[model samples]
Target: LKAPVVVLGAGLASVSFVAELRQAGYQGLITVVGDEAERPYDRPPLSKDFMAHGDAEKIRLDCKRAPEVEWLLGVTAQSFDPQAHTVALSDGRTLPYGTLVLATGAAPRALPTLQGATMPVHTLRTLEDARRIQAGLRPQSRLLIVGGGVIGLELAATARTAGVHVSLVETQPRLMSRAAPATLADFVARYHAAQGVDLRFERSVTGSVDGVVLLDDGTRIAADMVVVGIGVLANDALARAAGLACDDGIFVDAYGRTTCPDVYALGDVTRQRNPLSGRFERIETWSNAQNQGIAVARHLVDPTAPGYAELPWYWSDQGALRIQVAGLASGDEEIVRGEVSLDAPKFTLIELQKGRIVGATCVNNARDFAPLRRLLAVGAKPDRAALADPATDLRKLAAAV
Candidate 1:
């Protein structure tokens, strides 16, 4: 505990962990290394507000929330020697560590086919990337977004709002295929289409031909600029090269301990156990990065502390619609309470397993979401009839369980 604690990424997870370490009375030397020149910042805004305002100042993480530490920005971690307890940095400096954290967040998956394109192809991951894309959001600009996931959909919504001509193509048949339920996905697709976004399903980008994006269907879409949001790959090469166990992502336990001794990982980089699914998966969500970092920091300060088991939840804002989902969005059984039609302003879809609440998705129904989320947290088995009745108070149903 006397040696310096080195955090190997300056993202949300690293900042929150450092803050929690200080709060837990661990007043020791702490250092953070990041390849980005800017200080740790919120990433969700990169696709949402930052695109609109192009304001760099608003996206920075609050300085007050994190502990003061030696920040090594614009440098990367080249290698790690776990046995020697040292890290080799890009600047040729070797730093010893008592504890090491691998918060090296994931990177955007690139489209090799568009490598030598004449027009700029962007990905929303860093501040500079956001600025680059923001600059292209001019009125009447042809924007071809190459994915229908959250990032692409969010950007499409923003671009459409700014009067940019947007055409979103998804290789999958539905939007947010992995994250949302089929019903919710269809609703989101309909909403975006209503807003003048050209949404093409089951389409793949073959390549770019003379500044036109060619799809698998042989349709040519003129694109002034392209933004690919296919997916992300975990930045686990460092851990893997160091002989740590990794499968797509670094595997970590509830306490954030990786296979390698004294090495821990969190955030998008770690494939931790999903409490709902009981499988190891990378949860690339804002809440996971913030809460898991704090949880791991507390566990480090007190080994006997209970391991982190937070309910997975995420929220997305696309135009006038606000979508919030907690736990598994899809399950064997789904109970619908309230209207789920496209015109309905509020609705809740609850996923159940053996009569126990396992997950819930709320569309503009924060009131119902609040209690339903709590019910899922405790595996409550509320009466199905009462839950389906809009007249029944969710709080009362939660309490009854």
Candidate 2:
């Protein structure tokens, strides 16, 4: 089938691109190619609510305001020939398009080499994976999660509600070590431990089978089910094979344009040059993907359009707590406000560089994040003394004279 635009992968980025394209009054033909049979859906809930309640319909993205687009679901893209402007499907069907958007997203990191590592082990990157894992999570089931990142911790929180015993193993010195501050990590670690989760900090798994996980420390932990949320490897093999500029992921300009003309990539599969971080970084957050998808849509409509300006934002729901972060926090000095209240669990950690606010992380307090975001956007720097004061209003701290 021939269309003006062909978006690969039915993930959030592709769907968002289609919406943005239509919103921009591009009435051309749009076709979406997806490897999965299921309709487009929000992936964040797959590891949380959908895991608890197996309501497939509720997770669909095309439920209400459906996009009038063709969906080639359950068919994987075999390869792409940029010179021919054609994509070959696994079933030997070739589709032609004026422009192509690659949003295949990332795949879960596999578990360590060991017996039973491939058997019924859960990895929640897709709705199907969630369904499989949900069915496997029974009451009193021992869950040995191999990663201590957000996905693993989130699953641990949900599994605990089902009366499942959770044992988390991370090689990092602290929980969520790469993404969060030390205090934030300690708070989450203590919170999970209080919930009866056996959290093993700085622990690495050597192997596992049946109901036992062998740690690097030569300790064995019994587990009936396993969930691996270690990390993600971008689905850039297809793009890389097609001779595109791929460094870990498909390298893209500010507008998500690849090295090839009329070829664009976004979402977890794109190593985009982030405006906030001022560097080429691959952000696998829903907001970044969706925003970049929209940006690419604008770029397609107008070739000379500027890059996306939306501040990078991310959130993770953990049990009763809400984790929100604004802007890019990588390679910065974090200044935490006051002592973290374990009982109250209220704090804002600001990431700074040379006294300029680069990023801000808030847990439980949503209002503080808004001002923090605004201040960080313009490189606002609050006085060290005033910022340390708990009563100092952040909104007014950087106010004009």
Candidate 3:
């Protein structure tokens, strides 16, 4: 472990891990390799604020907090040799390491029919991708966005705010079907409709001809630009080639240790266990990349430190609304704590399993959401009556639990 450490990707996970290692008094040599030419930057804003304003500096990750490590930019990792403890890069160079950190994140999933598209087609996974999409959002330009995930919905909101015509199509029947609950999804769908976005669900793109998108039902939609936000595919080719456990993503334990000894992974590249569901899942939020990277660094520094077992949580900002969800969105039973009406700005939906809090979702209600999240983290079980009562102080209730 005294030898140099080589990090595969220079994204958030690699940067955070190196920073935490430096803070923990690890003085070993660290080298970070990234395919992108630019330095590390925050990605969440790329689909929201950066799309509207096109401010690059505002989203750049602060490097001063991390250690002074060697960075090999604009180079890809071609292969990994777990036995030799080395990595071969696309630049015809091989580097040795005592520990190899596989932070190679995911890439946007694309449609096969859109390959070599005649019209403008985009996917927001990198800074350059965001730049292209943002530039296309003209005042009266028509934008056709496929998929109803977080990226698609966020872009829809941003585009509508910029006076761009948006037509969103999703194969699923609701918005954020995989991420949010059905009730929350319905609320979000209504919100987008009110903003003048043509929301089309249970529909898919069959092909495109002469800058027009053809749907499965034989309907054609003309667009000035197109963006596909369906999902992402993990960049686990290096791990799989190195003979490590992988299923859609690299499999890792709570400590970020992979099947291979002295090799580890974190962030979107890893399929770690969900404590609530007891299944391995890829948590691709910013918080996961930041916190899990620190957790692994701490474990490497001191084996006695607690392993990483943080509950999954994420937040999304659409238009003027801020939505946050912690833990499982769908549980065995759901208990609503506030107004269920779509017009109401603030509400909280709590998910329970056999009387134990498993998850919660809050819409513009962070005041109550904070305590509720803490209660869920600690496995608290409060009286059903008190939980449903809006007048009850949730902070005090959380303390009691």
TM-score of each: 0.97, 0.93, 0.97
Which regions of candidate 3 fall more than 4 Å away from where they truly are? 341-344
Please give, for residues 160-248, the per-residue lDDT of candidate 1 as tens digits.
99999999989999999877988789889988998899999998888897789888998889999999999999999999999999987
Candidate 3 clash pair list: none
Q: What digit string (tens of lDDT, one per residue) describes model 3 on residues 1-401? A: 44588999989988898898888878889998999998789899988999988888998887776767899999999998988889999999999999999999899998887886799999999999999888788899999999988999899999999999999999988988776878788888888898898999999999999899999988999999999999999999999989999987999998999999989999899999888788889989888999899999988988898889888888899886689988887877788877766575678888888788898888888887889879988988888777888788889999887
The collision pairs in model 2 are 211-223
Model 2 per-residue lDDT tens digits across residues 1-401: 12488888988898888888887768788888999988788988877889898898887875233257888999899888998999999878998888888999999978655535644577788887998899889998888887888899889999998899999888987888656666677788888898888988787888876667778888888878788888989898889899998977899887778898878898999887666667777788888878888888886776677777666778888886798877755435777775676687888888887888878889998878888878877888778667678888887776651
Per model, state how many residue pairs clash.
0, 1, 0
Q: What is each predicted model's overall lDDT from 0 to 1?
A: 0.89, 0.81, 0.89
Query: So what's the TM-score on candidate 1?
Result: 0.97
List the lowest-lDDT window of 10 residues for candidate 3. Answer: 337-346
**Cα lDDT of model 2 overall?**
0.81
